[PDB]
Structure 1
């Protein structure tokens, strides 16, 4: 009802597991709450400039705004935070992008971001994290970090299955656990909240399957299964066993030494990709202490949230970290930072995250020239130290830029 389909423009289709993108594709975008009003306009202009420059006017995106979050309630009504129409629009047009989203508190509503992921079955959360020269960073050698996180996106405790302490359901579940499953380890059964943590074999293998294909298509050096399997043997640990098993079953994994690592040969470059694993709490230490040893990461939903968010901070990219939610049929790219309501509307915020997510989106569309230009623009703008206040306040000799002006700087550095 209130979305306007672009007069000129054409739908992306999926054929044979491969996107068919027209030169005039319609892309759905969600402005986002808070500073989404600042960064989305910059992102539109930066992407159009990259597309115009890479294909000399032969291609062009027909943006189409759709809604989620506050703007959805002001467009559709009182408690329409995520209209069915927005899900249908993303499935019809295959590829979309959105700014920051916040979920209201006090109405029993659970994460809108996670709702999008789970209802579009975008089981890959893809966070590439690598250091942009010139970025102010808390660690000494941020340039050693160059990883790609494959975070499982629908199952784990992150999935939102839980009962409230003292509710009839929680006490029903606890009664079933103690009396029918014989559980004795619930220290205090009264006034106790309960959460469920599921992890299946198919969900594990389609997430690791994507990670290893990614290592192959991008010739990277390894895939590390991160887990907390010595405590949670049947979810985290199973994730790690199924991941190794997939590597053997579908990518000819061979045993290194006495194990447990494997090596997968890259069919296209001959490079032996190492498959290995690290327990999650030690991994949070290793990304600081021995960052160059890691590359592609495969892990479950909650660990992936932590790991992405720790890596982004340690390269000083907490505000420019790109992110994508990808499934077999649809894809939703997103700004990964908060809504920062304090500065919303002041044209202050750093648009780098949603712009790099747009870079991912173009590359997912097969428009790699335009995507390369955006990386190149971020490269030069940040290396030139012409940046927004969240960068500039941490450093000397930088030129302070509004949000919109940083978008221009990126275009100027393409």
Structure 2
């Protein structure tokens, strides 16, 4: 192993489903491909500053670099794109953060980001989207956007079950469907690629459960199940039916009017939480035309991937869109954006995304004060109109800052 365990740090433990965070926790991190080389260093500095200022030296993170992707090949050798120790370490230290990752073409290499999520069973993809005062947005009222996406992270089409057109496997599968299952619906069975889409009751319910619990835990107004159930009855439709069923069976969901919407009483604030659903295509117009009407979103893997980007663009873009992959044993924080090789190495991209993901990590560890300083700094720097390229557009009088520069601006406004 080429990983070096920090000497002055201590491992975080999980006792009774509750995190036990030391004052010197060891936090593993993956630099990331492309721009990850730009944003990650900015994140480490901003986090260290937030922690240093919040607890005046009482607390401190012991960063431990781990590898995945290109750098892993440089470190562990050719073909070692995702070392087993990397998965071992994330699960063992409970909390980790990663920069963007890119999977090479071919080589029989599976998508590295999806591999991490699925190998660690981090079934929740949590992506909160809200507006930051001063952020240049293409819409008229970005302030109306304040939602939290709970995207199922372990099934759907992301299962990776598919076969190439004209391949022996594809023909074998197509032969079984037409001959044994009597399927006559394939328009062109020749030179036809095939993909499988699974959706289970347990996969659906553990995701929705987390979404409702988060709504209750943070006193949100509603949980909206987004699906395309009118066309995919047994997968997307099942997801919606299972979600409503869980709200009734586990949260005392009560019929609103003649339904289908339910109301769940917040055990804490006594507030009634609305449980509704919207068809995916229609939802894409709704978030733009009636944003204020939506809060927490529970949806399947693919739909969540699309909604994440559509919402982010509403409040400034993917440069300010954080996220987290959460499971029962550990959590891996990461920004919604990619490696943008186009800008890679230029120290020009917006580090806000990975930084706000670190803010989620801090909150997750219970270091809410350090988390609050990051939000304060971010809001201060953006308001000071000292921002990165992606914000400069739709920004008159804004001063352009380099990636590392913006990080410093955040610390300056803490």
TM-score by length of 1: 0.99
Q: Secondary structure at the match of 1:53?
A: helix
* Distance in 2, Cα, partners of 1:195 & 1:346: 38
List per-residue Cα deviations over 1:167-221 (Å, max 9, x = no partner).
Answer: 1111111111111111110111111111000000000000000000000111010
Q: Secondary structure at the match of 1:287?
A: helix
Do 2:27 and 2:93's aligned partners in 1 also have CA atoms closer than 8 Å? yes
* Distance in 1, Cα, partners of 2:346 & 2:176: 53
List per-residue Cα deviations over 1:277-305 (Å, max 9, x = no partner).
Answer: 00101001100110100000000000000
Q: Secondary structure at the match of 2:276?
A: strand
Q: Secondary structure at the match of 1:234?
A: coil
Q: Secondary structure at the match of 1:329?
A: coil
List per-residue Cα deviations over 1:4-48 (Å, max 9, x = no partner).
Answer: 000011111111111111111000000001111111111001001
How far did 1:348 drift? 1.2
How far did 1:393 drift? 3.8
* Distance in 2, Cα, partners of 1:342 & 1:228: 34
Q: Is the aligned partner of 1:322 residue 2:307?
A: no
List per-residue Cα deviations over 1:294-350 (Å, max 9, x = no partner).
Answer: 000000000000001100112123211001000000100012212122322222111
Do 2:156 and 2:300's aligned partners in 1 also have CA atoms closer than 8 Å? yes
How far did 1:110 drift? 2.1
- Alignment length, in residue pairs? 414
Do 2:308 and 2:336's aligned partners in 1 also have CA atoms closer than 8 Å? no
Q: Secondary structure at the match of 2:318?
A: coil
Do 1:135 and 1:317's aligned partners in 2 also have CA atoms closer than 8 Å? no
Do 2:25 and 2:61's aligned partners in 1 also have CA atoms closer than 8 Å? yes
Q: Secondary structure at the match of 1:282?
A: helix
Q: Secondary structure at the match of 1:56?
A: coil
**Partner residue, 1:248:** 248
Q: Secondary structure at the match of 1:194?
A: strand
TM-score by length of 2: 0.99
Do 1:122 and 1:154's aligned partners in 2 also have CA atoms closer than 8 Å? yes
* Distance in 2, Cα, partners of 1:221 & 1:187: 44
Do 1:131 and 1:317's aligned partners in 2 also have CA atoms closer than 8 Å? no
Superposed CA RMSD: 0.9
Q: Secondary structure at the match of 2:235?
A: helix
* Distance in 2, Cα, partners of 1:283 & 1:374: 31
Q: Is the aligned partner of 1:13 residue 2:37?
A: no
* Distance in 1, Cα, partners of 2:100 & 2:320: 12
**Partner residue, 1:72:** 72
Do 2:138 and 2:394's aligned partners in 1 also have CA atoms closer than 8 Å? no
* Distance in 1, Cα, partners of 2:313 & 2:299: 19
* Distance in 1, Cα, partners of 2:271 & 2:53: 35
Q: Secondary structure at the match of 1:96?
A: strand
* Distance in 2, Cα, partners of 1:45 & 1:303: 34
Do 2:134 and 2:385's aligned partners in 1 also have CA atoms closer than 8 Å? yes
* Distance in 1, Cα, partners of 2:46 & 2:218: 25
* Distance in 2, Cα, partners of 1:340 & 1:189: 37
How far did 1:384 drift? 1.4
* Distance in 2, Cα, partners of 1:130 & 1:6: 35
List per-residue Cα deviations over 1:221-245 (Å, max 9, x = no partner).
Answer: 0000000001000100000000000
Q: Secondary structure at the match of 2:320?
A: coil
* Distance in 1, Cα, partners of 2:172 & 2:192: 12
5+ unaligned residues in a row in structure 1: which ranges?
A: none
How far did 1:106 drift? 2.7
Question: Where has structure 1 moved over 4 Å in runs of 4 or more?
Answer: none
Do 2:163 and 2:194's aligned partners in 1 also have CA atoms closer than 8 Å? yes
